[PDB]
Design a protein around this ligand. Structure first.
Ligand SMILES: *[C@@H]1O[C@H](CO[C@@H]2O[C@@H](C)[C@@H](O)[C@@H](O)[C@@H]2O)[C@@H](O[C@@H]2O[C@H](CO)[C@@H](O[C@@H]3O[C@H](CO[C@H]4O[C@H](CO)[C@@H](O)[C@H](O)[C@@H]4O)[C@@H](O)[C@H](O[C@H]4O[C@H](CO)[C@@H](O)[C@H](O)[C@@H]4O)[C@@H]3O)[C@H](O)[C@H]2NC(C)=O)[C@H](O)[C@H]1NC(C)=O
Ligand code: HEM
Ligand SMILES: Nc1cc([C@H]2CCN[C@H]3C[C@H](Cc4ccccc4)[C@@H](C3)Oc3cccc(c3)Cn3cc2cn3)c2nn[nH]c2n1
Ligand SMILES: *[C@@H]1O[C@H](CO)[C@@H](O[C@@H]2O[C@H](CO)[C@@H](O)[C@H](O)[C@H]2NC(C)=O)[C@H](O)[C@H]1NC(C)=O
Ligand SMILES: *[C@@H]1O[C@H](CO)[C@@H](O)[C@H](O)[C@H]1NC(C)=O
Ligand SMILES: [Ca+2]
Ligand SMILES: [Cl-]
Ligand SMILES: [Cl-]
Lengths: 464, 103
């Protein structure tokens, strides 16, 4: 049992405790860690590699699932309306909630012993890790059903299957548009955006669309954005008393907070009107994830940054310099050289003391240490890894929304009008949302607008 | 692998017609660089006490976190140009791209 043992026996790779740890005084204890499943179990021939359980494509598989039995189970098979299943026990001000999962070992039940609210069921298994993630999953579930209803009235001749697939296709396209038009320019900054994601031309069947092993660790740069609380706000965007700022170590797997503490509208409001944490070289990640990760469901609070580093070792990822060289970036060999790259000598000194050489700095650690690119939230190394991955997911996807034959010229012109704030308007009781760009807008009322001003998705070009 | 289709499969299979598992679920990640293991093929760096990586001792992941990541919560800097929605879309998007299973 990796969960309770400190013995390093496969598949356990527990994180050891250093002397003078600020939290774990018992040096015979450990932070539990299971090695990722090998692609070829027991082999002495193959170089160990890991598995991606999901479709790499930006296809809303977190909504629909990446496996056929699960995809079937998430659908409402009780009629021919092509809808996804909704919670049968609870509603959110008369609006759909995700169905519950029928888990034997449900972590969500341990977050509030009396509430007895189990984990939700979505396309991806992690849907209940934080209520803000649950809210985004619920929002998209509602958007599919809203689309499947709006298509039934336009085309009464279409059966269930056609309604489900056509709504799935639109949802998939919305995730692509929001990701590449609004999200990625703000992650990468404009120079990295032009370098790694130049204007789309067309599908290219020679572009490998797989997720690279390094991306699974590099995309964890998001851990530096995490706030130590979940912020909830009322219809006037004011702190929702009681508990408007719940510590993160009290929200992990707390599906009950979505059912009994106001639904998803206060959560979405808090996401829109609260600023993200800024990654700074001496303020990398908060103690709610660094000291108290999942503490109410486990024997010990975990350390997400430390888990990231142990994971990159588990995955056999090369160090910082090898990745800088892969990207065509200079490779600092010493503390003085690293100081220049990081434009921060104190940070270089700290890194060198730990690692001895920039060749050994773990990819996440080195990546998040780099100064941020102008109007971006990653340095050159992460911009390269992330930008290269997303170009492959776009140029390598036959069903990319702009690819000839996926949608008509008219359907594409209609899809270009979508936005995440408008999705929030059509599926919640929220009447005042963030102005575009939703990822930039963070101050109420300065960056907020009325839903009526936002154009809706015109489905006219879907009439058969 | 059908010659003509209108919708994606659930597994991602057949998106690439020449190599139909590419981007499909439950497959090995692609590698952009050869892996680096203590024994060259399976054991992670830090697995064996005393075994150095490229001439240097392996730092404990928890020690790196304590020495480099740890900072006083009261000091947190809010990002004037990013919403928490920027953080949440990231995790949501990540959950459309990869999930690395464990035993
Ligand atoms: C469809 O996409 C294909 C993939 O393109 C890549 O991915 C996309 C997302 C973009 O990022 C794009 O920039 C990427 O290239 C694309 O095919 C690719 O085309 C390039 C250019 O022709 C090919 O590069 C050539 O490779 C050969 C072979 O060696 C390579 O592989 C080995 C082993 O991994 C490496 O060790 C090498 O360093 C190379 O990477 C080279 O010999 C060749 O270089 C020589 O020739 C050029 C001029 O011809 C000189 O400038 C050089 O100095 C050398 O003398 C190129 O580097 C690439 O291999 C190929 N990839 C695949 C998978 O086929 C295709 O062109 C796109 N089609 C359209 C219409 O867009
Ligand atoms: C609510 C905020 C977030 C978490 C809680 C959280 C937690 C994790 C954990 C526990 C893992 C697995 C750790 C391990 O290797 O043992 C994890 C993996 C990854 N994350 Fe995390 N994460 C939260 C938030 C984010 C954000 C905002 C991210 C990106 C913008 C982000 C990304 C990822 C990714 C892609 C991974 C790897 C997933 C995989 O198995 O392939 N996380 N995070
Ligand atoms: N690769 C990855 C993994 C996870 C784990 C983290 C929790 N680990 C243990 C702690 C509890 C015991 C729990 C697993 O019980 C679960 C039981 C069933 C399904 C899940 C969780 C699904 N699931 C898995 C994660 C979250 N949700 C994660 N979370 N956010 N991003 C993530 N990426
Ligand atoms: C667990 O959830 C329950 C609700 O099911 C919370 O209980 C409420 O607590 C307040 C005081 O804090 C009381 O006024 C309510 O009457 C309680 N409701 C019920 C139904 O008991 C409880 O606070 C949550 N527990 C924790 C530890 O957060
Ligand atoms: C299926 O759809 C009907 C009509 O919208 C709804 O009343 C019912 O609750 C749905 N079933 C499930 C399991 O979501
Ligand atoms: Ca996917
Ligand atoms: Cl249910
Ligand atoms: Cl890789």
């Amino acid at each position: 049992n990796c969960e309770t043992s400190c013995v390093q026996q496969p598949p356990c790779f527990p994180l050891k405790i250093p002397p003078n740890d600020p939290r774990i005084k018992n040096q015979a204890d450990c932070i539990p860690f299971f090695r990722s499943c090998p692609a070829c179990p027991g082999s002495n021939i193959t170089i160990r590699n890991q598995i991606n359980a999901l479709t790499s494509f930006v296809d809303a598989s977190m909504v629909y699932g990446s496996e056929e039995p699960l995809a079937r189970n998430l659908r409402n098979m009780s009629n021919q309306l092509g809808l996804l299943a909704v919670n049968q026990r609870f509603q959110d001000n008369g609006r759909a909630l995700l169905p519950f999962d029928n888990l034997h070992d449900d972590p969500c039940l341990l977050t509030n012993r009396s509430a007895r609210i189990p984990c939700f069921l979505a396309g991806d298994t992690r849907s209940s890790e934080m209520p803000e993630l649950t809210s985004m999953h619920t929002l998209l579930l509602r958007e599919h059903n809203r689309l499947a209803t709006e298509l039934k009235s336009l085309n009464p001749r279409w059966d269930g299957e056609r309604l489900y697939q056509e709504a799935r296709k639109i949802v998939g396209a919305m995730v692509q548009i929001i990701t590449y038009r609004d999200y990625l320019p703000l992650v990468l900054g404009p120079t990295a955006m032009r370098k790694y994601l130049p204007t789309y031309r067309s599908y290219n069947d020679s572009v490998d669309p797989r997720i690279a092993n390094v991306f699974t660790n590099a995309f964890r740069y998001g851990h530096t954005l995490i706030q130590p609380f979940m912020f909830r706000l009322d219809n006037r965007y004011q702190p929702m008393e009681p508990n408007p700022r719940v510590p993160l170590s009290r929200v992990f797997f707390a599906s009950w907070r979505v059912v009994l503490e106001g639904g998803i509208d206060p959560i979405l409001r808090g996401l829109m009107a609260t600023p993200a944490k800024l990654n700074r070289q001496n303020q990398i990640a908060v103690d709610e994830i660094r000291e108290r990760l999942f503490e109410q469901v486990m024997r010990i609070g975990l350390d997400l940054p430390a888990l990231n580093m142990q994971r990159s070792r588990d995955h056999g990822l090369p160090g910082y310099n090898a990745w800088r060289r892969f990207c065509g970036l200079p490779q600092p060999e010493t503390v003085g050289q690293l100081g220049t790259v990081l434009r921060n000598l104190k940070l270089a000194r700290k890194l060198m003391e730990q690692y001895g050489t920039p060749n050994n700095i773990d990819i996440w650690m080195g990546g998040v240490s780099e100064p941020l690119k102008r109007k971006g939230r990653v340095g050159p190394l992460l911009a390269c890894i992330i930008g290269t991955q997303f170009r492959k997911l776009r140029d390598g996807d036959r069903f990319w929304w702009e690819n000839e034959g996926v949608f008509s010229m008219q359907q594409r012109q209609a899809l270009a009008q979508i936005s995440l704030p408008r999705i929030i308007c059509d599926n919640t009781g929220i009447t005042t949302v963030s102005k575009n760009n939703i990822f930039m807008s963070n101050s109420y009322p300065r960056d907020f607008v009325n839903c009526s001003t936002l154009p809706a998705l015109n489905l006219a070009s879907w009439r058969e | 692998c059908p010659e003509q289709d209108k919708y994606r499969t659930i597994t991602g299979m057949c998106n690439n017609r020449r190599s139909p598992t590419l981007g499909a679920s439950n497959r090995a990640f692609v590698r952009w660089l050869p892996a680096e293991y203590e024994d060259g093929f399976s054991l992670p760096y830090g697995w064996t006490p005393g075994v150095k990586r490229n001439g240097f001792p392996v730092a404990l992941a928890r020690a790196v976190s304590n020495e480099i990541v740890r900072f006083p919560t009261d000091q947190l800097t809010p990002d004037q140009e990013r919403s928490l929605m920027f953080m949440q879309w990231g995790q949501l998007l990540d959950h459309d791209l990869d999930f690395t299973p464990e035993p």
